[PDB]
Ligand binder design. Sequence first.
Ligand SMILES: *[C@H](O)[C@H](C[C@@H]1CCNC1=O)NC(=O)[C@@H]1[C@@H]2[C@H](CN1C(=O)[C@@H](NC(=O)CC(C)C)C(C)(C)C)C2(C)C
Ligand SMILES: *[C@H](O)[C@H](C[C@@H]1CCNC1=O)NC(=O)[C@@H]1[C@@H]2[C@H](CN1C(=O)[C@@H](NC(=O)CC(C)C)C(C)(C)C)C2(C)C
Lengths: 306, 306
Amino acid sequence: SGFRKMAFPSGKVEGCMVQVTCGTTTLNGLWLDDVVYCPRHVICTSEDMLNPNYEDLLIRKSNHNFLVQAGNVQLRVIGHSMQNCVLKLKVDTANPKTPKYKFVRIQPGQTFSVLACYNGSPSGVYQCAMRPNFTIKGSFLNGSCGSVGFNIDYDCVSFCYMHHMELPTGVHAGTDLAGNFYGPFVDRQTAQAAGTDTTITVNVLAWLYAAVINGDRWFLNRFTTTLNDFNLVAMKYNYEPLTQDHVDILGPLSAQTGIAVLDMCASLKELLQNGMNGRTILGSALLEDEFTPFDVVRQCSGVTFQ
Amino acid sequence: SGFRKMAFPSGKVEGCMVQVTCGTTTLNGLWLDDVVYCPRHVICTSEDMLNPNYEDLLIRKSNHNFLVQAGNVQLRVIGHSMQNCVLKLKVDTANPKTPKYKFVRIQPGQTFSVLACYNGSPSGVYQCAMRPNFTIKGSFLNGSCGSVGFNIDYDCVSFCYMHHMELPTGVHAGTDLAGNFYGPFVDRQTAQAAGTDTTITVNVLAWLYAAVINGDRWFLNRFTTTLNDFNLVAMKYNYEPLTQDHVDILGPLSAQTGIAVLDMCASLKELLQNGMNGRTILGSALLEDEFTPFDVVRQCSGVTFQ
Ligand SMILES: *[C@H](O)[C@H](C[C@@H]1CCNC1=O)NC(=O)[C@@H]1[C@@H]2[C@H](CN1C(=O)[C@@H](NC(=O)CC(C)C)C(C)(C)C)C2(C)C
Ligand SMILES: *[C@H](O)[C@H](C[C@@H]1CCNC1=O)NC(=O)[C@@H]1[C@@H]2[C@H](CN1C(=O)[C@@H](NC(=O)CC(C)C)C(C)(C)C)C2(C)C
């Protein structure tokens, strides 16, 4: 037992992290086969980042302007090209540590592991969810750009996120590995607002199931509710509407615990309307929404990767 | 900005994890140079674990009873010996992935990263603190024994924890890498109680400093308090007494924020006596105590490892 916010083991990604320096900008790149991916705002100066035209900026660059360091070994850039908001630097060596991988774009509500990195050196690993407003609540300082987010499914790393920037609220924005931003953001140093967030309803329910699996049962009840009447409570507390496919994906957890999905909704309704009254659930005094049904089933069952 | 519970990158440890099977017990071992370390209760049967005499049990074992698998490659056991509650299995290959390492015993209040492992395959990574009662609030299922806990300081892995067992409250107990248990526990399947816990006071204060660094300031005040009068509040709420060395270690954080340590204690006092009134601190509705002053300074400054 126990329930922790748990990231994937990071080793396979650590082996791909490199340092990319252009001019007076240094950030991280991701080295897979003979390509290094990194955020395109590395080509910019401090007064370039204020309103840049990246095509104009990149045609003035050459291969030798890109210093790529795989630890203490310099990689030679032999080509460069821009794909949306990422740069693809072709180097003269293939990464011998290249894992089996995919580039996948995730849905809001889904989770991933972030390997925070500085100067090409991994610093820490933690779990994040893609918020409904396409931001992520991360931990990122100067020089963390190009750190990636990922999931691991057996031996294959599915990269879903590259870090680009921090919004004024202290949340973080970035792209998939094809360089397309999550959300209505641009890699420009001007004011941009995140869009109003919501709580990920199906994730809260999954976490309640994790709690029951772990022996927290004080919030259970013999009441029930229709899906329709749950959602009138949901909109009232800025929770996402629940769909029948969310009920279906909660099916296995419903089955293991013997608590019908709609019964657990009645419990969530009561927690929303009354609060917790000085109690906790899995060591939290808040309703937690950054665990997916998948996350619960992995941790409360025990899947591995090789 | 941002503040996350952040583990060390796990790659260096992933390369040391192996599967150890004896009889009908399988668990994880830690493979460093030509030795595999694992919990000694692997030699036991189901009715051995109820009241075992381990010296008697081990003299009846031989090298060939220990099946060690480094992935899909079998390691050959050429010696075995018992050091307290761990076994040391000498194998015929040195691990070529052996990091620079140390075996260190940590103090309650200190934190470390756990690489949860099943069948020799790493499953996830997360952060833990050693509770004042020498337990840890982990996430561990059947077969997770032998997963280790560690810190990383530049290139050197300091191993501090090996997992052995789960107490009836759902907390976890284990040993340092010399096989000496943390706390008054034995590797015996009988009832054992954890001892009463306390909150790690200096850690809460460090986390309040992390919050200020990140822009949560609503709990600040212009009141102050003497160290003496803070501790009368501390014992009242089951918090650890604060010492002058805790004030000293909080010095740098005190300096960056400009909030005197004793001023922050006055704030903690008020949070203890009034609660939070529907507000959060760094996304938590509870006072968090599993971040050390070191943890705050790493995350709010950005140290790496290579
Ligand atoms: C790249 O490592 C860096 C990572 C930032 C620094 C602090 N925390 C982070 O996540 N990104 C940038 O510096 C980013 C590039 C310049 C300005 N950038 C910012 O993130 C800005 N943020 C904004 O100007 C506001 C948003 C809407 C852009 C700050 C945090 C440095 C002020 C690019 C080209 C956007
Ligand atoms: C080893 O992988 C396993 C890990 C446990 C299983 C569930 N969660 C864990 O952390 N350890 C053991 O099975 C452990 C060995 C036998 C009994 N063990 C237990 O942890 C017991 N716990 C107790 O009997 C109570 C404590 C005081 C020992 C349970 C959880 C399996 C009932 C050893 C020799 C103690």
